[PDB]
Amino acid sequence: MYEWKLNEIVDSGVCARCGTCTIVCPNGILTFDERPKLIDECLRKGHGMCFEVCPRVSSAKYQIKIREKFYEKYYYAKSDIEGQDGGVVTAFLKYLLENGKIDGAIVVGDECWKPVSLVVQNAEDLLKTAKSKYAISTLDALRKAGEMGLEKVAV
Amino acid sequence: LRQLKLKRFKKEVERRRENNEYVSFYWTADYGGIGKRADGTYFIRVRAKPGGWYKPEEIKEILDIAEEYNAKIKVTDRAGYELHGISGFDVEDIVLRLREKGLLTGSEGPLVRATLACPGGGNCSSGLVDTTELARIIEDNFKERPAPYKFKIAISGCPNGCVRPQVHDIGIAGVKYPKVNEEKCNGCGRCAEVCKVEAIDIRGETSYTNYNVCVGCGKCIKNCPNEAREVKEEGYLVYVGGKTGREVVEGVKMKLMSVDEIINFIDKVLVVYGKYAEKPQRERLAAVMKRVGYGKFLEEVKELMKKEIC
Amino acid sequence: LRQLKLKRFKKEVERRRENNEYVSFYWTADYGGIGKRADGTYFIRVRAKPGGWYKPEEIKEILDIAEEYNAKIKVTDRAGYELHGISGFDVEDIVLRLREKGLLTGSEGPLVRATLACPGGGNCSSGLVDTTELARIIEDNFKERPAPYKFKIAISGCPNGCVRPQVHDIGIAGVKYPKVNEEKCNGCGRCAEVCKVEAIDIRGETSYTNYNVCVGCGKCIKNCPNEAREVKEEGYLVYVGGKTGREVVEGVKMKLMSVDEIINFIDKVLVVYGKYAEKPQRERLAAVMKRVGYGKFLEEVKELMKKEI
Amino acid sequence: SGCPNGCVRPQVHDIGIAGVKYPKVNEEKCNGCGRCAEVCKVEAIDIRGETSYTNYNVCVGCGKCIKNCPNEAREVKEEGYLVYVGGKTGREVVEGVKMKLMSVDEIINFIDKVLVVYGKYAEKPQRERLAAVMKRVGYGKFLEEVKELMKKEI
Ligand code: SRM
Ligand code: SRM
Ligand SMILES: Cc1cc2nc3c(=O)[nH]c(=O)nc-3n(C[C@H](O)[C@H](O)[C@H](O)COP(=O)(O)OP(=O)(O)OC[C@H]3O[C@@H](n4cnc5c(N)ncnc54)[C@H](O)[C@@H]3O)c2cc1C
Ligand code: SF4
Ligand code: SF4
Ligand code: SF4
Ligand code: SF4
Ligand code: SF4
Ligand code: SF4
Ligand code: SF4
Ligand code: SF4
Ligand code: SF4
Ligand code: SF4
Ligand SMILES: O=S([O-])[O-]
Ligand SMILES: O=S([O-])[O-]
Ligand SMILES: [Ca+2]
Ligand SMILES: [Ca+2]
């Protein structure tokens, strides 16, 4: 078989099924639908950045928090866009695209409620993704955005 | 909702423990001073207290935790504490318990490590400057501050460098240089005996100092029975770009600095270090200074120091 | 008679204390690890235990003394303990009390200071050799041994030198150098990522090591997923003539040594150091080695090492 | 080099030779005139009352104090060729290690054996200087072998 270090995290059920490990593979030998899968032999046996970005191997929150210096400001809002709740996430993505703050938005769309990771560069296409998908989602569109050559994105 | 999710998490971790299922203790990286031992257990590093001074209540808490969890007690060469043999299930409980008693876990990772200070002035008979308050000021301003790689500061009370200021990212050493008062000096010869570097020359009815050898220990001023030796220059001598570990790099002697100047200098050096660092967790300050040039690096540090208004 | 004279002495010291008469605590120099603070009181230095490991019973005793005498507790950078604010009247009582619990006072004066060792093998994930037992062997053979000036030994478990082997009178560092097995190496590139010194080159279906950069941390052997890296050379790398303090002197890299060789080497370096030292309490090993010459000094150390066997 | 002033840089050469002449004071002849301390560039001499002393931790063995003593109170303590090995300059500076005083025959034997051990352990011709090979195998191990080969010559 083809050995993969992250199999212990996946087989134990600790895996968050976030899909971060598969988008970072520089050989594109990892795919993600509802769980990580090797489509080819890994020469490192998974001893690489798929294992190192995994939030279930190590959170790395302390080193990230002291650099990000997060704070907490609580607000609530609603927008003209119809969304899951107030449609705030879509309204914010629409604003960032329209004001040239991002080249594209990494959002979750759907086909029969099956989540689909998409790269959105137009506001009209944002409306189709404005709703919660409670099925497992992926971050696959971030890899597509990279192949497209997009400089900045919102996820 | 946060508490309901945390309770569900605690329930699942306990269930896995009871059924001998695999657990990845990924949340241990939420805290500072956490490391994994060769045997699979963890060690918790208490960030060293300024000057290596610990209250009996502080040591007693470490002793209670060690006995309760059957952990080994280790003392570090930066005068810190480490609790070895901690299970991943108890790491978070111990860190929060230590935090309540003021014992912050840290001095680990790419950040400013525990400041190392000697007893110095008021404690050591060779001490020329206060080291305990300076260490507290530096700890209050930069403790656990992120950097491209580990950053270590040492404060020595005199030029004997007990805490190695010459091989630290930033080294501070107390200095007191002498000058001879010819009206009071009678060539008794006592000062030459207290000088370890042998910088003094006794000639007839007077004495001299070789300033290329003198390290400014001030022993000759203190031990002159005729008060013929006076303070020429005094203060905190600063070094920058020192390092030890895989390789030894001697820090460069800068100049005498006031406490406010030292705080400004430490901050600016960190800013210029972060600006020019290309490889986090590999490049120490010395490597970044060498690559961009000491002159270019230090002239930027000076420009930023002049701009400082707080 | 010895006890009668001691009782008379104790009676006179107590009488002076009660009448506020001057007392010179000259007998404090009968013990090791004693120093005088700037304020007139004393500090008692407990010779650091090997590896900085302390039993709970030991730390509790230091805590009891500190609270009884209202003394401050200081931790040293050699992982030792110091009790500050001790009165000259209580110094002797505290030293003998500490001695009963196995806490010898020392690591002070012109002698072999407390041996500094890191957790090393079995404790630290980077550890390549055992440092705790080696530190115990060195402590048992040379603790408090007289020398022309202070003599400091440091044992590191790997080349990261956490206890600074390159600037110690004698420095020991665990090393594990790699060699590549071309039949198993496939150029996956994982070894180059674990190398802090960047000594590895990944080329096609193989990998190489620059031995002018490699420090022998053995991380590439340990972290190779295909077991393609093997041990080329392994053991304790030794350094001599290093120091810190007023000036920095880097020790000279000698060679790999067995534990018996290390003990023989430490003993013979001390013998040749004592033979050539001219100024006790001023000349460190590095100064004596520099004055007589490193070649001449080390040649004699080797001749004495051969005579031991 | 003919003296410790190292005009041809013996401390940064693969093999460096420097002439040295260390002093010793004859108390019967020394009167504390103070002339020797003036000719010492390193300031290793101390003039005290009717005598003089030398700090051997500073003295470089230039022999100026022996030559310029008007009362012939300074004599030769030790004399000869001081040898250094493993030094270099160029892309990086490496200071050579001070070995010991050597006779001319010893120097020739030493140069030959350092070249033999250098050739035996060098892995990268045109890249590794003696200093790099000495550092990689260890100065102790390298010099121990040089000595073993030197003994076999005789
Ligand atoms: C505990 C301690 C040794 C001791 O016995 O006291 C220690 C222990 C470790 N050191 Fe260290 N270092 C310790 C002081 C040092 C010092 C001296 C100092 O800081 O005063 C040095 C050299 C001085 C310097 O760095 O300027 C030192 C040089 C390293 C290095 C190589 C650093 C370099 O830049 O070359 C590493 C690994 C790395 O950075 O790649 C390292 C890494 C480590 C790690 C965390 C191994 C690792 O990479 O994860 C070791 C933890 C093992 C354990 O069980 O504790 N340790 N380490 C010291 C912790 C003091 C503290 O409380 O903060
Ligand atoms: C406590 C400690 C500083 C600390 O905060 O940890 C310390 C404290 C003193 N040192 Fe030290 N030295 C201490 C480690 C060092 C180190 C580092 C080390 O050894 O690990 C150095 C530089 C490293 C080295 O020497 O290789 C150091 C370099 C000195 C020197 C300069 C010696 C030299 O060769 O340049 C002196 C004075 C002297 O020897 O002339 C000195 C002398 C002293 C004295 C005893 C001053 C004196 O002559 O009476 C200081 C006692 C003050 C006090 O209250 O403790 N101390 N001293 C360290 C005791 C560790 C221990 O348990 O043994
Ligand atoms: C699985 C899931 C569980 C949630 N659980 C809670 C909860 O317990 N409590 C709570 O208060 N809120 C929860 N939320 C958030 C809530 O459902 C809304 O998404 C949120 O309030 C924002 O709504 P909005 O109208 O402002 O955004 P909208 O304008 O509707 O935009 C929604 C955005 O969510 C993204 N999205 C949708 N599904 C996914 C997915 N599976 N993964 C990643 N992105 C996705 C879309 O791409 C879009 O950009 C959950 C969301 C999800 C997806
Ligand atoms: S180790 Fe590298 S090549 Fe292999 S699966 Fe992980 S990211 Fe991909
Ligand atoms: S990165 Fe996410 S999907 Fe991949 S193994 Fe880790 S938790 Fe699972
Ligand atoms: S550096 Fe100076 S003041 Fe500080 S402990 Fe050492 S001798 Fe004392
Ligand atoms: S101890 Fe004082 S009076 Fe005596 S020689 Fe020195 S400076 Fe002059
Ligand atoms: S200050 Fe110290 S080093 Fe300088 S001359 Fe006086 S005793 Fe010597
Ligand atoms: S010297 Fe090596 S084995 Fe010892 S504590 Fe440091 S990293 Fe670990
Ligand atoms: S990690 Fe192992 S298999 Fe991969 S390139 Fe390095 S030596 Fe070869
Ligand atoms: S042993 Fe260490 S320094 Fe040497 S090539 Fe391997 S990882 Fe690099
Ligand atoms: S020059 Fe000669 S006589 Fe004069 S002090 Fe020197 S050694 Fe003595
Ligand atoms: S031989 Fe030269 S360096 Fe030595 S004391 Fe005489 S003049 Fe000074
Ligand atoms: O723990 S070491 O990195 O200071
Ligand atoms: O007393 S200091 O030299 O360890
Ligand atoms: Ca390379
Ligand atoms: Ca002099």
Residue numbers in the entry:
A (entry chain B): 1 to 155
B (entry chain B): 311 to 620
C (entry chain A): 311 to 619
D (entry chain A): 466 to 619
What is written in the article reporting this PDB entry?
Fsr organizes as a homotetramer, harboring an intertwined six-[4Fe–4S] cluster relay characterized by spectroscopy. The wire, spanning 5.4 nm, electronically connects the flavin to the siroheme center. Despite a structural architecture similar to dissimilatory sulfite reductases, Fsr shows a siroheme coordination and a reaction mechanism identical to assimilatory sulfite reductases.
A single-wavelength anomalous dispersion experiment was performed to solve the MjFsr crystal structure. The crystal structures of both Fsr superpose well and were refined to 2.30 Å for MjFsr and 1.55 Å for MtFsr. On the basis of the observed electron density, we tentatively modeled a SO32− bound to the siroheme iron (2.3 Å) in MjFsr. But both Fsr structures revealed an additional cluster ([4Fe‒4S] cluster 1), which has a noncanonical binding sequence (PCX40CX54CX2C).
